[PDB]
Symmetry: C2
Subunit: 285 residues, 2 copies
């Protein structure tokens, strides 16, 4: 039994991400989310997270020796698998011999997944958000376009010029855009990226400056995301982490990206409104 | 002793990189160059390389836990050191306890260097070229500027927008710019970046399209570099590699960036002009 998002096409995706004052706080699993028995960038972890909360998943596509795109964050295999060396030293088939490790170092029986497997699974359940490692931008553009996956596979962009590369190739793409400053807001505008095609990553922490950016972005219809992965996820107790996740929502932030999405869900459950224009986008499978 | 480049100020650096038909073919050590007993991104490898050839060094700055800039390519420690985990997990004091591995996996008694130490050492000897890992652009701009290191520390930029960010901060910066297509040529012009401040990285291989871009760039006074690191450096024998390096220069390329810069030097020494407008920039220490 899983929580799902109900986004049938690009118009639904744009709507989902149009800021509204009655919006539902959103959760995104950093590198898929992780936990005891649940490695980063694993199909199993995505599925586990949806059993507790609706979420999107930010993932790490990178290349094997035979140019297969797999999900795996690091430049070396040791932290989140029982392998050694670079992902790009091994074919996909060879990579299947390794097993993923959870954050405690326990070796699971889960394998490195392909991006294709994740995309096929995500359709009708969630939205994936692609970070950039070593897959060429043109390849990423073509894979999403060829697969008609625009309604459920978003692209992370660090500035307006990268956004424009993608947007000019396919104007139905949706972006997670880095927007940490007033100058960043101007950058996207100068590059002609529609705000309707933007959800904004505003950084790892809230400051008065970042609050001003969030107000600017809300005026433009843009939802804003804090990533707690480097910051509040690292607090020593679940109780301190829970307080921190609630404080982020109380400050007006729309989306929390976290390595601990289930904890985020439990902490903010009491903040989820009963009535919302966004209620229609949520269901269960 | 050592081969040195004799560059006294930013005007000398600009003139060094002004394309001329009688140029001296140049060599750049990718990730600093490497070899048996000589790890990537190591002071010792830079010094060894200069004993055999003049060269520049392309290096990988990244952040420690306490925001010190060190040189280390991978996001995790296992391939080129005896460390485990991420460079950013450790403070500089902790990282100094680890030791570097050469490409065959042999542990040396060499440490992960700071960018500062490298900059200190490079002054009067060579030019360092900074790749982009996780040091933000603002921080890179500051450190070069604060150190008055513009004549000997270049910044790699992937497009005109990145170049513009830097150039607006300090119009004395010199760039290694990615310029792989006619569209990329136009990008730098549209962003107002003077060609006098650009050396061009044109990719890992020569094709007719790339030869056309090299022609265009030569017309604009821009010297062009091929990286052999993913390509010709991987050929199986030193003889095949040497033929490959000569062919690159025969095809009109100005600069070879390589993991094997001493081999490049030995291969192309027979192609170095005996009289050149660029002779003045080379000396010995
Ligand atoms: Na320091």
């Amino acid at each position: 039994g899983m929580n799902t998002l109900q986004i049938s096409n690009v118009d639904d995706l744009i709507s989902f991400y149009q800021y509204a004052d009655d919006r539902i706080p959103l959760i995104s699993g950093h590198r898929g989310g992780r936990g005891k028995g649940y490695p980063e960038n694993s199909m199993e972890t995505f599925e586990n997270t949806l059993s507790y909360t609706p979420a999107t998943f930010e993932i790490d596509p990178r290349l094997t020796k035979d140019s297969v795109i797999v999900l795996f964050h690091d430049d070396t295999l040791e932290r989140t698998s029982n392998g050694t060396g670079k992902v790009s030293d091994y074919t996909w088939e060879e990579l299947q011999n390794f097993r993923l490790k959870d954050p405690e170092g326990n070796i699971t029986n889960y394998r490195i997944p392909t991006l294709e497997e994740a995309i096929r699974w995500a359709r009708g359940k969630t939205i994936l958000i692609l970070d950039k490692k070593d897959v060429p931008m043109e390849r990423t553009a073509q894979l999403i376009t060829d697969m008609q996956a625009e309604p459920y596979v978003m692209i992370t962009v660090h500035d307006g010029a990268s956004a424009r590369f993608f947007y000019e190739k396919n104007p139905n793409f949706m972006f997670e855009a880095f927007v940490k400053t007033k100058e960043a807001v101007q950058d996207y505008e100068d590059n002609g990226i529609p705000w309707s095609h933007i959800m904004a990553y505003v950084g790892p922490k809230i400051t008065p400056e970042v609050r001003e950016v969030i107000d600017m972005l809300h005026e433009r219809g843009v939802m804003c995301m804090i990533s707690t992965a480097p910051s509040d996820d690292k607090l020593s107790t679940p109780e301190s982490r829970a307080e921190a996740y609630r404080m982020i929502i109380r400050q007006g932030v729309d989306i929390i990206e976290s390595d601990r999405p289930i904890e985020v869900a439990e902490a903010i459950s009491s903040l989820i409104p009963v009535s919302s224009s966004k209620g229609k986008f949520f269901s269960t499978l």
